[PDB]
Design a protein around this ligand. Structure first.
Ligand SMILES: Nc1ncnc2c1ncn2[C@@H]1O[C@H](COP(=O)(O)OP(=O)(O)OP(=O)(O)O)[C@@H](O)[C@H]1O
Ligand SMILES: Nc1ncnc2c1ncn2[C@@H]1O[C@H](COP(=O)(O)OP(=O)(O)OP(=O)(O)O)[C@@H](O)[C@H]1O
Ligand SMILES: [Mg+2]
Ligand SMILES: [Mg+2]
Ligand SMILES: [Mg+2]
Ligand SMILES: [Mg+2]
Ligand code: NA
Ligand code: NA
Lengths: 312, 313
């Protein structure tokens, strides 16, 4: 094929339950219904890549358990067609998962179990695992696995001359400078970028400031995701390249939007498209994603994205 | 060959997460860890019967999802040994599951998605479905599937002349008198016994009276589970049979204890043991269960229950 997309990151079973009200301590309650879906930022991103018919590997850790089974079925040969060669299962950790309680009062409460995502990685990455990233077209990371692993990968590929994108989605802790210095492109939303720099982000102006602070701390490029306001690519060798939303006829479910945006973006970039094309390819993919319910369910095939890009 | 134990009931993925406290509205907390296990009272009871080497069939409804395959894997040919011939899966409902939140404060909170357990049954059972209960040597029911399905099954066996046990475990709702009328043995714990009859159960005299009230509701035999106090078989017009606990060296995890007790009782009964032998064999099996974590994983094999019986006559 071509030099693959390599996503190193998280895979989660998302367990949604529709509840009237969170139960009281001691109390047992019933849900209207519930559905358990393959999810996690790394898996979403890898799934998106494989749907865009680009060669895509996922490097991650699962428990040897039902949720583990659920993730591989969804990403693999019977699903999105991600290469799972570098996924390892372990027997002493649960597959990561999240209990998403959708309360009837409009509210939503969440419990997260890092499980294998956080606890099943080696102290030192294997040479096998480093072999796939050193052979990668582009590497995608997030923050739902330990920074230590993110750093080891980023260093391996920096040596190799392979571009690495770090999505900031994940743990609400500061990013290690040694990680910030090894990545090519940092990719926050307005919220993340804000809590990242301690600076406000309600205007393009003050957003552009926090990005300066990011540039200052060793980050050559910031791909900011701005929800309904579109998105901007800041290169600290230029001024922000911008791209707004491709409007969606119906917006049912924004879940998966950011992951789709980032993966789509990364696929265009390894297909050697230009920055403007990259942004629009990603904007188109995300647009199609928010028109369907579910994250991995909603992700567009390449044909659908190319068809939409035809419009002016 | 031997007329099978036949269990009709629930199958759940039990999703356990360890948290310091419950979250607030909007709040995303982090659990310490988690584990998903095959459970549900029906699957537990089936698995327990299979592990005791009595031919066991499980009748239930799964979704065609991962949780579904987890159940089948645990119960089936490569697992406990339950015949699954009569398990049916549907595409329009998920396998039942339960989110169990183990708090740091000892408090537990549960969220139950009934799923296929409650929504994948026909309005009317097929003769295909009821053929197995008509050939049972004994039938066990619980209250984690629709009352209406419990009723059709129990009636089909009353016409067949085979003993039906109803575990009160599950829904905390009143029991349809039609159901009560068609079962041979009711099996509540003391908390269930109270809620059911409406009577208090703090003392044995009180319990004996709440059982008199079960007797007035159409059930000739009541098998009361009294936790660490033991158990008792009440048979209308006869002297109650009492059985204390068989002490466990280590109470690790009482999950599945009541299910083990009831299924073990059933196996001893359909094999023709005396009431006292049934109660004792059920007490021994439940004793072993509480010494291992998990429900289905802690279920003892026959030779161990019998061994614990020698050394604690
Ligand atoms: N209402 C919308 N209509 C069309 N496209 C949208 C809409 N909202 C978001 N998008 C697309 O999705 C992209 C990413 O969304 P957003 O900036 O919210 O990412 P995020 O907050 O990281 O998402 P997530 O919550 O999924 O992690 C946006 O840049 C935009 O192109
Ligand atoms: N600590 C213990 N030591 C030994 N045996 C025990 C212990 N706790 C329970 N058992 C056995 O388990 C049986 C059933 O327990 P219990 O009456 O609490 O069931 P239950 O409340 O229906 O259980 P569950 O909550 O699992 O549905 C008891 O009668 C007893 O024989
Ligand atoms: Mg957003
Ligand atoms: Mg995001
Ligand atoms: Mg009890
Ligand atoms: Mg019970
Ligand atoms: Na979506
Ligand atoms: Na146990």
């Amino acid at each position: 094929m071509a030099p693959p997309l390599v996503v190193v990151g998280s895979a989660n079973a998302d367990i949604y339950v529709e509840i009237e009200r969170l139960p009281k301590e001691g109390e047992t309650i019933s849900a209207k219904t519930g559905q358990t879906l393959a999810g996690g930022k790394g898996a979403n991103q890898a799934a998106c890549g494989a749907k865009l018919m680009y060669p895509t590997y996922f490097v991650g850790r699962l428990g040897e358990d039902a949720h583990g089974k659920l993730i591989a079925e969804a990403l693999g040969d019977d699903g999105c067609g991600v290469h799972l060669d570098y996924v390892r299962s372990v027997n002493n950790e649960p597959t990561g998962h999240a209990v998403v309680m959708l309360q009837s009062d409009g509210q939503n409460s969440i419990i997260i179990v890092g499980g294998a995502n956080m606890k099943a990685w080696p102290e030192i990455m294997s040479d096998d695992d480093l072999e796939i990233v050193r052979n990668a077209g582009i590497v995608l990371l997030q923050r739902e696995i330990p920074d230590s692993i993110n750093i080891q990968v980023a260093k391996a590929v920096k040596k190799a001359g392979v571009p690495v994108i770090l999505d900031v989605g994940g743990m609400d802790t500061p990013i290690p400078n040694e990680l910030l210095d090894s990545i090519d492109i940092l990719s926050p939303n307005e919220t993340e970028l804000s809590r990242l720099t301690g600076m406000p982000t309600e205007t393009f102006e003050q957003i552009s400031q926090a990005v300066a602070k990011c540039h200052k701390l060793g980050v050559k490029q910031v791909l900011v995701k701005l929800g309904s306001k579109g998105s901007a690519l800041f290169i600290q060798g230029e001024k922000p390249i911008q791209q707004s939303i491709i409007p969606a006829a119906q917006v049912v479910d924004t879940t998966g939007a950011g992951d789709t945006f980032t993966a789509a973006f990364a696929v265009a970039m390894v297909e050697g498209k230009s920055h403007e094309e990259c942004l629009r390819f990603a904007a188109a993919a995300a647009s199609l994603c928010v028109q369907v319910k579910g994250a991995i369910p909603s992700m567009p095939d390449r044909k659908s994205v190319l068809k939409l890009l035809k419009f002016s």
